[PDB]
Write a protein that binds this DNA or RNA. Structure first.
Ligand SMILES: CC(C)N(CCCNC(=O)Nc1ccc(C(C)(C)C)cc1)C[C@H]1O[C@@H](n2cc(Br)c3c(N)ncnc32)[C@H](O)[C@@H]1O
Ligand SMILES: [K+]
Ligand SMILES: [K+]
Length: 552
DNA sequence: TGGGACTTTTTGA
DNA sequence: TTCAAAAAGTCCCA
């Protein structure tokens, strides 16, 4: 790694100032002149140095009141520095050099005496035996997903942090849990993390832990905005407390324009109160396992559709992920590749990518998949294995199932069942800016970037493929799905079965007209001299029908 | 260097 | 035996 020295992970100063102010704005320094403020991912001290400055001003502005109320010899301006570093600032980080630099910076904040002990711990914050809780906790924890996390460390997290970390969870789930655990009664925590846990299936346990253990004061959701320059992550700020209150309401600040520069205003509060953000309140007591954080109009819209629709896609359809070859370059070839003359056409499948999926129809495929699982003997079709697949034999053997012997070196890692793909079905891209559900007539295969489903036999008399793609591609359903969809990056939502199959659908008197409009759209889209203007008009008419059906 | 087009296979269950 | 989730995405260009 050692990319931390570049500065891409440095938290923007406006974010840091907001989080520190959020935690310390209303601290009664007279009542408690010994607040413990902690950052368990302090790094070089982006947060902790600002904490020092805020504390110094807070002590200096009340120095005489402190001198009068308490030991008058102890409370002096010249003593403020020492008192802060002795009793107030706490930092933990696993990088020794970061701790050393932070110690030097904190010591140089004053610039002889005997010695000042700075409470900086070089350790694994997730393993440290914390000997006391803290008044305030701030910072930016590390984010590490299931692929990039070390195996032994992952075993430790699975054993010890099972309440929030399991399956495809992230390391910052555990940091959330640790922060909550060591926060004092009545304390306040404020952190910047990825936003994905708000909606992701992996974050269900983490959402339950937060909801049941702290009061969430505020969620700032930047959606797909690029808060961290040259980092592909979407960020949010969470502020929570352990204060005894009867109010269970959350301030949600949801950005409206993802193309804004965060330095537009001198402070984050100006941006939050501006027209660039929307604000609304969510009753924490009404949160289910999912957190539906939308304004009143969207909530009314969502509840109307949920109540009106008696079926869901999961009820009526069978869903599946695409082929996972485990090495696409060894099995995927251009349809015009001369090497395909070496492969019998019985082994060749049409192969599409997510970009080949439009609304209602799939682009003509330009790639072929060698379904190598049907190769019986290694001696037969030896040219295919020697001249096409074997070119990547080493990387093929590094696959998990090849090393365990479950798969031959030339087989597909996850070849699924051919019969699921070789039928009329609906396909949609796994990540997209809008609903794009297409009817596949061409027995197209795909990788995991395209998901498929087909209608169950018992529901074929009630739902047709043409009707489903009509309502699923409508503006109503685009908005409806995005209400709870998992926002990933700028103009990209996840379209994964764990949320797509929860989409609810309806049947009523408009079924025939909606289906007919969808058929007209498909017929136009499949023409030779295509002009989509009529398609847009038909789509507008269909959207009007769907809005009439759902009463919105 | 910042923004847009596009998306693999490793992995736990 | 074999499913599906996971962006500190990845990569290119003006
Ligand atoms: C990095 C980021 C994604 N993350 C936050 C931004 C840190 N900010 C910063 O400014 N870091 C930094 C910068 C420069 C250096 C030098 C000395 C090499 C120049 C060191 C740290 C990760 C930070 O959290 C620390 N970390 C990682 C783990 Br994993 C961990 C842990 N288990 N316990 C405690 N601290 C931990 C990590 O040590 C890390 O600090
Ligand atoms: K006194
Ligand atoms: K982003």
């Amino acid at each position: 790694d050692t990319k931390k020295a570049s500065g891409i992970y440095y938290t923007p100063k406006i974010i840091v100032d907001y989080i520190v102010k959020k935690t310390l704005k209303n601290h009664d320094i007279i009542k408690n002149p010994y607040p413990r403020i902690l950052d368990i991912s302090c790094g070089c001290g982006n947060f902790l140095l600002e904490v020092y400055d805020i504390l110094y001003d807070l002590f200096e502005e009340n120095i005489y009141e402190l001198k009068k109320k308490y030991d008058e010899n102890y409370w002096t301006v010249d003593n403020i520095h020492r008192h802060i570093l002795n009793y107030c600032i706490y930092g933990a980080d696993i990088d020794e050099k970061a701790i050393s630099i932070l110690k030097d910076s904190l010591t140089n904040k004053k610039v002889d005496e005997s010695d000042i002990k700075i409470n900086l711990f070089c350790c694994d914050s997730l393993k440290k035996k914390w000997r006391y809780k803290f008044d305030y906790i701030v910072g930016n924890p590390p984010y590490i997903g299931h692929k990039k996390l070390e195996k032994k460390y992952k075993k430790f997290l699975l054993e010890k942090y099972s309440e929030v970390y399991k399956d495809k969870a992230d390391l910052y789930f555990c940091f959330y849990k640790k922060i909550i655990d060591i926060l004092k009664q009545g304390g306040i925590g404020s952190v910047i993390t990825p936003r994905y846990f708000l909606e992701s299936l992996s974050g269900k346990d983490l959402r339950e832990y937060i909801k049941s253990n702290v009061n969430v004061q505020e969620i700032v959701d930047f959606l797909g905005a690029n808060i961290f320059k040259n980092i592909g992550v979407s960020s949010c700020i969470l502020t929570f407390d352990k204060k005894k209150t009867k109010e269970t309401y959350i301030d949600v600040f949801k950005i409206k324009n993802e193309d804004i520069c965060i330095n537009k205003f001198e402070t984050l509060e100006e941006l939050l109160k501006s027209s660039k953000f929307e604000h609304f309140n969510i009753n924490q007591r009404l949160l289910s396992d999912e957190w539906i954080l939308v304004n009143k109009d969207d909530e009314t819209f969502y509840n109307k559709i949920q109540e009106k629709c008696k079926y869901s896609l999961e009820d009526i359809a069978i869903s599946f992920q695409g082929i996972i070859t485990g090495c696409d370059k060894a099995f995927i070839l251009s349809k015009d590749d001369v090497k395909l003359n070496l492969v019998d056409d019985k082994f060749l499948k049409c192969w599409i990518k997510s970009k080949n999926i439009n609304k209602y129809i799939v682009d003509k495929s330009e790639y072929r998949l060698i379904y190598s699982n049907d190769i019986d003997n290694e001696n037969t079709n030896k040219r295919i294995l020697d001249e096409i697949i074997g070119l990547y034999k080493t990387k093929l053997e590094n696959r998990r199932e090849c090393k365990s012997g479950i798969r031959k070196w030339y087989e597909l890692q996850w070849g699924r069942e051919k019969l699921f793909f070789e039928r009329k079905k609906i396909m949609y891209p796994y990540k997209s800016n809008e609903n794009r559900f297409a009817i596949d007539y061409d027995n197209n295969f795909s990788s995991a970037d395209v998901y498929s489903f087909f209608i169950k036999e018992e529901y074929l008399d009630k739902f047709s493929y043409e009707y489903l793609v009509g309502i699923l591609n409508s503006s109503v359903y685009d908005k409806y799905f995005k209400i709870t969809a998992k926002k990933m990056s700028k103009n990209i939502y996840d379209y994964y079965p764990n949320k797509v199959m929860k989409i609810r659908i309806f049947r009523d008197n408009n079924y025939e007209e909606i289906e007919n409009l969808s058929k007209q759209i498909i017929s136009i889209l499949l023409n030779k001299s295509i002009d989509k203007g009529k398609v847009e008009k038909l789509q507008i008419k269909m959207d009007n029908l769907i809005m009439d059906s759902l009463g919105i």
